[PDB]
Amino acid sequence: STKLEEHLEGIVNIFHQYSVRKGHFDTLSKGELKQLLTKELANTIKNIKDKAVIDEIFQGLDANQDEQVDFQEFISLVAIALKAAHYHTHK
């Protein structure tokens, strides 16, 4: 299995831990996507120069805390953050 694959695995795993710990097997509520992100991308978030971006995401995650979401949704939000940070993941 490839280098790229292994990291993808890593992220699936973490995502998967959250969903299971909070109820469902491969979806996780919005509410607890907000805590995921804020804990796990915290470095990255700090790095974002335009906070209006996560403010949104979040002012959106809070807005409907119970809707389950799947990894694809997850990863997508992870990436949007990622862009806003200019792909700096670092304290």
Next chain:
Amino acid sequence: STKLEEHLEGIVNIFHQYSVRKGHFDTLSKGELKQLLTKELANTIKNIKDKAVIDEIFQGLDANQDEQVDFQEFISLVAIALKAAHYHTHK
């Protein structure tokens, strides 16, 4: 960093190992993208039972091989492949 953030970074790196080879430096042509996937998702791919999920994506990429896509495009294409392989990323 964070396990997650460490994985993100590793991924961005792979992407840049690619992006950096031709043309513009933080993007690539879809033709290149198709090459990225063939090599770096190879088994996730050989692990997707519906052989049309990729096929179609690959068609899309051939049909406009010159068009430039960034990390976001990449990643969200990845997300699709992962989902189609129910997250099997080993041979």
